[PDB]
Amino acid sequence: DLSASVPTRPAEPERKTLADYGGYPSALDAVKQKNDAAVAAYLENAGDSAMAENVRNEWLKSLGARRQWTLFAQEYAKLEPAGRAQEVECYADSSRNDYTRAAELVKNTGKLPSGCTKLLEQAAASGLLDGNDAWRRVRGLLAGRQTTDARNLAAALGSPFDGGTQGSREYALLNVIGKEARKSPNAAALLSEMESGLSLEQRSFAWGVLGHYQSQNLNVPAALDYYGKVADRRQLTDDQIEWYARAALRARRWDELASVISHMPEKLQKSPTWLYWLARSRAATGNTQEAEKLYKQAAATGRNFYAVLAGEELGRKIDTRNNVPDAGKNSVRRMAEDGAVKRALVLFQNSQSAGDAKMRRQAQAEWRFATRGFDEDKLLTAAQTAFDHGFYDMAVNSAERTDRKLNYTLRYISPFKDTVIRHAQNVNVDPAWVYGLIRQESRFVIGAQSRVGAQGLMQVMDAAQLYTADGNIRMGTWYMADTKRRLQNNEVLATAGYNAGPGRARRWQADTPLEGAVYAETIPFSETRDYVKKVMANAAYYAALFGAPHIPLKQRMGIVPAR
């Protein structure tokens, strides 16, 4: 059952909501201009909104950088803890000389916000960083071309890049681990020579860089050779070790894959991906009981790609029956009366009738803010509220945030159904697949617009039709079908091709057939890799809702042909 409880935060007039949005972009500009007066002014009589919270966060990032600690302390105190930006959090801790966050932040080997980067430097100088993690971050930054951040961190650790000790040596290793040097045919040879004057840690990292590059280029034998020389796998960045795993996966080396996963950070080990592939590994080596236990863990992570695959290895097929009742109409009407939710519905209403894309995005921001910390019943109530106002993406996003209470008709909405079904049938493609793609591409926002310039529901006679929902869907489905036809009629390749181009999709094929999930998990582009898994997962959910003949997701993924 569902609770009818809804929040009752103070509601402002529509005119105030709109008046305050009127000044929102200027407030952000003032932050950028360092006009503290303007900002303070915007905030002093602002609603308790995402608008105020965003301005306050960006302001605090600015204030922290400029070392205006008095004003910082004052405004930081006005933020909701759940609403603080990571970097603002780092600035605040550094101002209190509290380096508690450093133990976890230092495990990140990539670019961090400036406040977070400086917190690690200060912690380093205070002898508060674990030496192993600290130097691993220095290498990661070096290998990721963040040379300045690597410099400063090495300096802060007491061994700068021109000091004759470790720092100078780590810097020196760029002849091997540089972004361009790693691609050299003699990178391996060069490392092999100087290996003698290298620490265990340095050697492991360097071989990881070489194997990572080969692996992400889908040169599997070479990758596994280089990775094979890594003595301490825990020295690897998260991307390096995942690509080690990906190489072992693609080569079907189950014993090595299991071994590699066992050396991952615990948080990586516990992701749906490596829960599943470790279970497959166990299953493939005869350790059934251990496999079954891991499939159970994986299935429990939610509605995602690997959770479904793991469910199928347990004989459990997807079931889209709701395990909760519909939200009651009275609840839904009352949820809309809440001040935070109303402010979101107001900005979203007015962005439609004013055609303001930016106002719509702030309405999304207000929705996230309004529903932050909602229990599952309120989430499900707010999801129907969004749906009723045509705020389709927030309907989906609210509904999918529950863990135990499942409304599949709100998680997998299907507006425009007579239009989508028709266009899909006209070019001979699965409607479930089409809905699956739309849900991922645009979250059913008819006006949706990518940075790359992709347009409409499908993020793609007269050409202008592209911008109407009928024309967009017509073109998207045609291109889905055409791309599929160009890629040996395979739906996994088509999905990758839709996102990255059919040239790339074909380039990622092996010279032997690949299991679909294996092709998908080893896609070199992280955005495309994630896209394919979500689209195909979505599709399996839509097929169930549509009452189509049951097709396991593992079967949907099928076999990707050799090229």
PDB file of C-alpha atoms in Angstrom, residues 278-430:
ATOM      1  CA  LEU A 278      32.511 -12.689 -11.470  1.00  0.00           C
ATOM      2  CA  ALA A 279      29.443 -14.924 -11.181  1.00  0.00           C
ATOM      3  CA  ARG A 280      29.768 -15.882 -14.876  1.00  0.00           C
ATOM      4  CA  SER A 281      33.420 -16.653 -14.181  1.00  0.00           C
ATOM      5  CA  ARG A 282      32.515 -18.902 -11.226  1.00  0.00           C
ATOM      6  CA  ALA A 283      29.790 -20.601 -13.268  1.00  0.00           C
ATOM      7  CA  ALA A 284      32.213 -21.117 -16.120  1.00  0.00           C
ATOM      8  CA  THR A 285      34.747 -22.812 -13.840  1.00  0.00           C
ATOM      9  CA  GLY A 286      32.312 -25.119 -12.069  1.00  0.00           C
ATOM     10  CA  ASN A 287      31.885 -23.155  -8.845  1.00  0.00           C
ATOM     11  CA  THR A 288      28.111 -23.115  -9.080  1.00  0.00           C
ATOM     12  CA  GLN A 289      27.235 -22.356  -5.473  1.00  0.00           C
ATOM     13  CA  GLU A 290      29.553 -19.380  -5.414  1.00  0.00           C
ATOM     14  CA  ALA A 291      28.074 -18.248  -8.763  1.00  0.00           C
ATOM     15  CA  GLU A 292      24.493 -18.483  -7.505  1.00  0.00           C
ATOM     16  CA  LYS A 293      25.373 -16.317  -4.510  1.00  0.00           C
ATOM     17  CA  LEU A 294      26.909 -13.617  -6.707  1.00  0.00           C
ATOM     18  CA  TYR A 295      23.982 -13.658  -9.163  1.00  0.00           C
ATOM     19  CA  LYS A 296      21.739 -13.038  -6.187  1.00  0.00           C
ATOM     20  CA  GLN A 297      23.842 -10.057  -5.134  1.00  0.00           C
ATOM     21  CA  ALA A 298      23.834  -8.727  -8.685  1.00  0.00           C
ATOM     22  CA  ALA A 299      20.067  -9.207  -9.148  1.00  0.00           C
ATOM     23  CA  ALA A 300      19.486  -7.243  -5.943  1.00  0.00           C
ATOM     24  CA  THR A 301      21.122  -4.064  -7.269  1.00  0.00           C
ATOM     25  CA  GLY A 302      17.892  -2.992  -8.993  1.00  0.00           C
ATOM     26  CA  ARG A 303      16.389  -2.811 -12.477  1.00  0.00           C
ATOM     27  CA  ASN A 304      19.644  -2.440 -14.405  1.00  0.00           C
ATOM     28  CA  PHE A 305      21.185  -4.430 -17.308  1.00  0.00           C
ATOM     29  CA  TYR A 306      23.327  -6.740 -15.169  1.00  0.00           C
ATOM     30  CA  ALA A 307      20.652  -7.176 -12.486  1.00  0.00           C
ATOM     31  CA  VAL A 308      18.359  -8.551 -15.198  1.00  0.00           C
ATOM     32  CA  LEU A 309      21.023 -10.774 -16.737  1.00  0.00           C
ATOM     33  CA  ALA A 310      21.879 -12.157 -13.282  1.00  0.00           C
ATOM     34  CA  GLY A 311      18.167 -12.732 -12.669  1.00  0.00           C
ATOM     35  CA  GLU A 312      17.984 -14.837 -15.811  1.00  0.00           C
ATOM     36  CA  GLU A 313      20.892 -17.019 -14.715  1.00  0.00           C
ATOM     37  CA  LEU A 314      18.730 -17.763 -11.658  1.00  0.00           C
ATOM     38  CA  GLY A 315      15.661 -18.669 -13.729  1.00  0.00           C
ATOM     39  CA  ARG A 316      13.922 -15.440 -12.712  1.00  0.00           C
ATOM     40  CA  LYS A 317      12.450 -13.570 -15.647  1.00  0.00           C
ATOM     41  CA  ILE A 318      11.405  -9.920 -15.673  1.00  0.00           C
ATOM     42  CA  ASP A 319       7.980  -9.262 -14.169  1.00  0.00           C
ATOM     43  CA  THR A 320       6.495  -5.805 -14.686  1.00  0.00           C
ATOM     44  CA  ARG A 321       3.481  -6.206 -12.362  1.00  0.00           C
ATOM     45  CA  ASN A 322       3.454  -3.295  -9.884  1.00  0.00           C
ATOM     46  CA  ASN A 323       3.953  -4.347  -6.249  1.00  0.00           C
ATOM     47  CA  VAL A 324       2.209  -1.192  -5.048  1.00  0.00           C
ATOM     48  CA  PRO A 325      -1.144   0.461  -5.786  1.00  0.00           C
ATOM     49  CA  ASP A 326      -1.521   3.618  -7.885  1.00  0.00           C
ATOM     50  CA  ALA A 327      -0.963   6.876  -6.043  1.00  0.00           C
ATOM     51  CA  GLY A 328      -4.324   8.247  -4.912  1.00  0.00           C
ATOM     52  CA  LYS A 329      -5.693  11.240  -6.810  1.00  0.00           C
ATOM     53  CA  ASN A 330      -6.077  13.235  -3.636  1.00  0.00           C
ATOM     54  CA  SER A 331      -2.410  12.632  -2.740  1.00  0.00           C
ATOM     55  CA  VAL A 332      -1.312  13.653  -6.236  1.00  0.00           C
ATOM     56  CA  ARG A 333      -3.325  16.909  -6.065  1.00  0.00           C
ATOM     57  CA  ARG A 334      -1.985  17.642  -2.576  1.00  0.00           C
ATOM     58  CA  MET A 335       1.644  16.821  -3.570  1.00  0.00           C
ATOM     59  CA  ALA A 336       1.267  19.587  -6.179  1.00  0.00           C
ATOM     60  CA  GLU A 337       0.286  22.034  -3.413  1.00  0.00           C
ATOM     61  CA  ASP A 338       3.647  21.621  -1.645  1.00  0.00           C
ATOM     62  CA  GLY A 339       5.705  24.789  -2.023  1.00  0.00           C
ATOM     63  CA  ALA A 340       8.809  23.098  -3.383  1.00  0.00           C
ATOM     64  CA  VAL A 341       6.927  20.811  -5.784  1.00  0.00           C
ATOM     65  CA  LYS A 342       4.604  23.657  -6.862  1.00  0.00           C
ATOM     66  CA  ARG A 343       7.570  25.878  -7.666  1.00  0.00           C
ATOM     67  CA  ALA A 344       8.867  23.117  -9.943  1.00  0.00           C
ATOM     68  CA  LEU A 345       5.495  22.630 -11.660  1.00  0.00           C
ATOM     69  CA  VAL A 346       5.233  26.400 -12.062  1.00  0.00           C
ATOM     70  CA  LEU A 347       8.616  26.774 -13.790  1.00  0.00           C
ATOM     71  CA  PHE A 348       7.817  23.749 -15.971  1.00  0.00           C
ATOM     72  CA  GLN A 349       4.360  25.071 -16.946  1.00  0.00           C
ATOM     73  CA  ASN A 350       5.727  28.467 -17.908  1.00  0.00           C
ATOM     74  CA  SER A 351       8.693  27.045 -19.818  1.00  0.00           C
ATOM     75  CA  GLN A 352       6.244  25.246 -22.116  1.00  0.00           C
ATOM     76  CA  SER A 353       4.067  28.286 -22.801  1.00  0.00           C
ATOM     77  CA  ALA A 354       7.164  30.485 -23.177  1.00  0.00           C
ATOM     78  CA  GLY A 355       9.308  27.969 -25.061  1.00  0.00           C
ATOM     79  CA  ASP A 356      12.180  28.563 -22.626  1.00  0.00           C
ATOM     80  CA  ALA A 357      14.545  25.558 -22.638  1.00  0.00           C
ATOM     81  CA  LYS A 358      16.618  27.063 -19.821  1.00  0.00           C
ATOM     82  CA  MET A 359      13.575  27.595 -17.583  1.00  0.00           C
ATOM     83  CA  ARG A 360      12.636  23.942 -18.139  1.00  0.00           C
ATOM     84  CA  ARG A 361      16.096  22.827 -16.980  1.00  0.00           C
ATOM     85  CA  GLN A 362      15.764  24.889 -13.809  1.00  0.00           C
ATOM     86  CA  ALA A 363      12.368  23.259 -13.275  1.00  0.00           C
ATOM     87  CA  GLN A 364      14.139  19.893 -13.379  1.00  0.00           C
ATOM     88  CA  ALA A 365      16.553  21.277 -10.799  1.00  0.00           C
ATOM     89  CA  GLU A 366      13.637  22.369  -8.655  1.00  0.00           C
ATOM     90  CA  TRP A 367      12.079  18.922  -8.925  1.00  0.00           C
ATOM     91  CA  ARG A 368      15.282  17.211  -7.734  1.00  0.00           C
ATOM     92  CA  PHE A 369      15.474  19.680  -4.847  1.00  0.00           C
ATOM     93  CA  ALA A 370      11.774  19.335  -4.005  1.00  0.00           C
ATOM     94  CA  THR A 371      11.876  15.527  -3.884  1.00  0.00           C
ATOM     95  CA  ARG A 372      15.267  15.187  -2.162  1.00  0.00           C
ATOM     96  CA  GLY A 373      15.011  12.779   0.745  1.00  0.00           C
ATOM     97  CA  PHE A 374      11.490  11.722  -0.202  1.00  0.00           C
ATOM     98  CA  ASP A 375      10.658   8.223   1.076  1.00  0.00           C
ATOM     99  CA  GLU A 376       9.482   5.703  -1.551  1.00  0.00           C
ATOM    100  CA  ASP A 377       5.764   6.501  -1.123  1.00  0.00           C
ATOM    101  CA  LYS A 378       6.328  10.239  -1.649  1.00  0.00           C
ATOM    102  CA  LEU A 379       8.580   9.455  -4.622  1.00  0.00           C
ATOM    103  CA  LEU A 380       5.801   7.391  -6.203  1.00  0.00           C
ATOM    104  CA  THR A 381       3.230  10.065  -5.444  1.00  0.00           C
ATOM    105  CA  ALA A 382       5.407  12.805  -6.931  1.00  0.00           C
ATOM    106  CA  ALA A 383       6.072  10.606  -9.982  1.00  0.00           C
ATOM    107  CA  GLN A 384       2.350  10.474 -10.805  1.00  0.00           C
ATOM    108  CA  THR A 385       2.143  14.183 -10.107  1.00  0.00           C
ATOM    109  CA  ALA A 386       4.869  14.832 -12.686  1.00  0.00           C
ATOM    110  CA  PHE A 387       3.197  12.469 -15.125  1.00  0.00           C
ATOM    111  CA  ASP A 388      -0.144  14.243 -14.795  1.00  0.00           C
ATOM    112  CA  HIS A 389       1.445  17.607 -15.664  1.00  0.00           C
ATOM    113  CA  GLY A 390       3.244  16.109 -18.680  1.00  0.00           C
ATOM    114  CA  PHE A 391       6.614  16.463 -16.872  1.00  0.00           C
ATOM    115  CA  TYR A 392       7.553  13.028 -18.256  1.00  0.00           C
ATOM    116  CA  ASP A 393      11.269  12.884 -17.471  1.00  0.00           C
ATOM    117  CA  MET A 394      10.682  13.751 -13.792  1.00  0.00           C
ATOM    118  CA  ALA A 395       7.940  11.109 -13.648  1.00  0.00           C
ATOM    119  CA  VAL A 396      10.524   8.521 -14.763  1.00  0.00           C
ATOM    120  CA  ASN A 397      13.346   9.903 -12.646  1.00  0.00           C
ATOM    121  CA  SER A 398      11.260   9.982  -9.433  1.00  0.00           C
ATOM    122  CA  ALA A 399       9.781   6.514  -9.952  1.00  0.00           C
ATOM    123  CA  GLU A 400      13.167   4.896 -10.626  1.00  0.00           C
ATOM    124  CA  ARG A 401      14.637   6.221  -7.369  1.00  0.00           C
ATOM    125  CA  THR A 402      12.708   3.747  -5.226  1.00  0.00           C
ATOM    126  CA  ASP A 403      14.291   0.414  -4.166  1.00  0.00           C
ATOM    127  CA  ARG A 404      11.501  -1.792  -2.740  1.00  0.00           C
ATOM    128  CA  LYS A 405       8.314  -0.190  -4.052  1.00  0.00           C
ATOM    129  CA  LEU A 406       8.021  -0.671  -7.795  1.00  0.00           C
ATOM    130  CA  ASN A 407       5.725   1.079 -10.245  1.00  0.00           C
ATOM    131  CA  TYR A 408       6.787  -0.167 -13.684  1.00  0.00           C
ATOM    132  CA  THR A 409       4.208   1.908 -15.558  1.00  0.00           C
ATOM    133  CA  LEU A 410       5.864   5.079 -14.206  1.00  0.00           C
ATOM    134  CA  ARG A 411       9.476   3.843 -14.495  1.00  0.00           C
ATOM    135  CA  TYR A 412       8.771   2.819 -18.109  1.00  0.00           C
ATOM    136  CA  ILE A 413       6.190   5.330 -19.341  1.00  0.00           C
ATOM    137  CA  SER A 414       4.992   5.118 -22.944  1.00  0.00           C
ATOM    138  CA  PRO A 415       3.499   8.383 -24.207  1.00  0.00           C
ATOM    139  CA  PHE A 416       2.976   8.989 -27.976  1.00  0.00           C
ATOM    140  CA  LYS A 417       2.164   5.289 -28.290  1.00  0.00           C
ATOM    141  CA  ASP A 418       0.060   5.303 -31.419  1.00  0.00           C
ATOM    142  CA  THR A 419       2.670   7.423 -33.165  1.00  0.00           C
ATOM    143  CA  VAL A 420       5.697   5.384 -32.054  1.00  0.00           C
ATOM    144  CA  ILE A 421       4.095   1.998 -32.714  1.00  0.00           C
ATOM    145  CA  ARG A 422       3.068   3.068 -36.232  1.00  0.00           C
ATOM    146  CA  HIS A 423       6.451   4.477 -37.276  1.00  0.00           C
ATOM    147  CA  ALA A 424       8.233   1.457 -35.743  1.00  0.00           C
ATOM    148  CA  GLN A 425       6.012  -1.011 -37.587  1.00  0.00           C
ATOM    149  CA  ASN A 426       6.456   0.953 -40.842  1.00  0.00           C
ATOM    150  CA  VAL A 427      10.236   0.365 -40.864  1.00  0.00           C
ATOM    151  CA  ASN A 428       9.959  -3.136 -39.401  1.00  0.00           C
ATOM    152  CA  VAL A 429      11.548  -2.580 -35.947  1.00  0.00           C
ATOM    153  CA  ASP A 430      10.627  -3.604 -32.393  1.00  0.00           C
TER     154      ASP A 430
END
